[PDB]
Amino acid sequence: MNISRMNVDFGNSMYMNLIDGYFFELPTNVVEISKEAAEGKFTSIVEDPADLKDRLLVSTVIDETERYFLVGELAEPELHNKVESHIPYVTFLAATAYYQALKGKREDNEVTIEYFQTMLPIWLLKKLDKFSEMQKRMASKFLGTHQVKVLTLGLEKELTIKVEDAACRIESEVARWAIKKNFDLEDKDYAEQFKNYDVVFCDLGGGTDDLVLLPAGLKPPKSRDSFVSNTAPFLAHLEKLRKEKLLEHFDSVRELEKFIYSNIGKTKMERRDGNTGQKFDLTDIIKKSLKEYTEIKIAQAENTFPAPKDKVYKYLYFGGVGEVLEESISVVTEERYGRDISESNHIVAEDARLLNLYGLEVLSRAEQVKKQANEKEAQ
Numbered sequence: 001m002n003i004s005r006m007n008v009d010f011g012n013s014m015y016m017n018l019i020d021g022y023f024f025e026l027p028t029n030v031v032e033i034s035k036e037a038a039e040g041k042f043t044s045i046v047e048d049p050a051d052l053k054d055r056l057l058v059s060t061v062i063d064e065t066e067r068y069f070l071v072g073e074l075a076e077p078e079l080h081n082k083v084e085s086h087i088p089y090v091t092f093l094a095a096t097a098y099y100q101a102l103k104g105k106r107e108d109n110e111v112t113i114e115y116f117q118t119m120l121p122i123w124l125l126k127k128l129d130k131f132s133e134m135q136k137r138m139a140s141k142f143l144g145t146h147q148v149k150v151l152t153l154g155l156e157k158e159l160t161i162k163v164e165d166a167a168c169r170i171e172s173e174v175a176r177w178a179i180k181k182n183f184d185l186e187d188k189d190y191a192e193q194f195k196n197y198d199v200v201f202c203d204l205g206g207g208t209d210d211l212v213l214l215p216a217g218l219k220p221p222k223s224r225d226s227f228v229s230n231t232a233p234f235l236a237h238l239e240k241l242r243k244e245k246l247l248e249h250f251d252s253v254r255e256l257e258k259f260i261y262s263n264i265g266k267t268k269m270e271r272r273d274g275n276t277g278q279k280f281d282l283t284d285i286i287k288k289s290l291k292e293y294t295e296i297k298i299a300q301a302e303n304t305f306p307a308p309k310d311k312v313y314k315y316l317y318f319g320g321v322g323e324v325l326e327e328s329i330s331v332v333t334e335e336r337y338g339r340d341i342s343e344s345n346h347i348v349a350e351d352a353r354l355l356n357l358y359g360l361e362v363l364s365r366a367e368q369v370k371k372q373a374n375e376k377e378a379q
């Protein structure tokens with residue numbers, strides 16, 4: 001099987017990837033188990049490749065040792081350095097094997113990837129004096145030939161995966177390409193509102209909040225000071241909310257997190273007991289808590305890059321939390337700056353959760369065009 005473009009967002013909450021324009025995502029969990037635990041782990045055969053996604057049991061050889069991993073939703077009932085940790089690498093292998101099983105032939109045991117692309121979080125890059133070298137090591141982790149075994153009964157095989165070319169971009173910053181261009185590499189009219197304003201890109205996530213200062217026209221950051229990461233996370237805010245106000249309704253922060261993004265955006269946020277179908281309106285409690293958090297976010301962003309009083313900044317909010325907070329952001333910015341500045345200067349991205357990934361996708365299409373241009377000039 002041949003893959004032209006593969007773009008990966010190793011999130012803290014979800015692994016997400018686009019493979020030749022095809023989207024799917026997996027829970028980030030990777031649990032390492034022993035050989036005997038993996039045997040007699042999985043009991044009944046599966047035949048439909050789609051079922052593999054929730055049943056990812058793989059092995060791969062690491063430092064000449066064959067090790068066994070539960071990946072994604074199968075790892076569920078059981079901030080890492082993205083470069084030196086095996087977790088992203090193992091997730092990538094399982095993801096690729098899943099896509100092969102879903103879209104490819106049973107007897108095809110080989111996958112070639114022309115162009116692999118991922119990225120690194122700002123909090124990790126800022127620890128080093130040079131971003132480029134860490135990004136190069138990240139890319140090198142995926143370049144070349146790898147093998148993985150699928151041990152899920154019914155879909156067993158050892159897959160050889162060959163990555164011909166690989167690159168690593170900067171999270172949050174790279175998302176600007178999803179605003180600048182569409183996948184046909186046309187300039188977006190949507191980006192014109194940022195033609196004359198420096199923009200603070202606010203990547204609001206579950207575990208970090210990363211901000212990039214983009215000079216007018218969504219141009220590259222001027223220096224290292226234009227990249228900032230914060231850690232007083234959204235998940236801690238939810239788990240404090242759960243233990244204080246909602247202990248009755250959620251036994252884990254993951255449950256509360258799932259209920260919120262599933263239910264934010266409608267007028268009533270209703271919790272549904274499965275046994276008796278009884279109803280609990282949790283709307284007031286939740287929007288109130290989200291507004292609190294948003295007030296902290298707006299203030300952080302405002303204070304992160306001290307806008308000089310002869311400059312007007314605009315703010316573009318994204319990430320999965322940005323998506324959830326969209327309503328809250330509109331309310332809070334209107335209270336704080338007035339309606340006019342709220343609407344024109346505080347923008348929540350559409351596809352906020354997927355913007356980084358989409359930025360990779362745009363770069364991979366430009367790269368793909370560049371390649372074909374180069375190869376035809378080669379005569």
Ligand SMILES: Nc1ncnc2c1ncn2[C@@H]1O[C@H](COP(=O)(O)OP(=O)(O)O)[C@@H](O)[C@H]1O
Nearest residue numbers: 011012013014205206207208261319320321323
């Ligand atoms: N459809 C969705 N699936 C999963 N999470 C979502 C979804 N929509 C919004 N979210 C929110 O996205 C957050 C994860 O944000 P993300 O940008 O992935 O940051 P991180 O990678 O740090 O978790 C979750 O806390 C969740 O509340």
Ligand SMILES: [Mg+2]
Nearest residue numbers: 011205319356
């Ligand atoms: Mg992210």
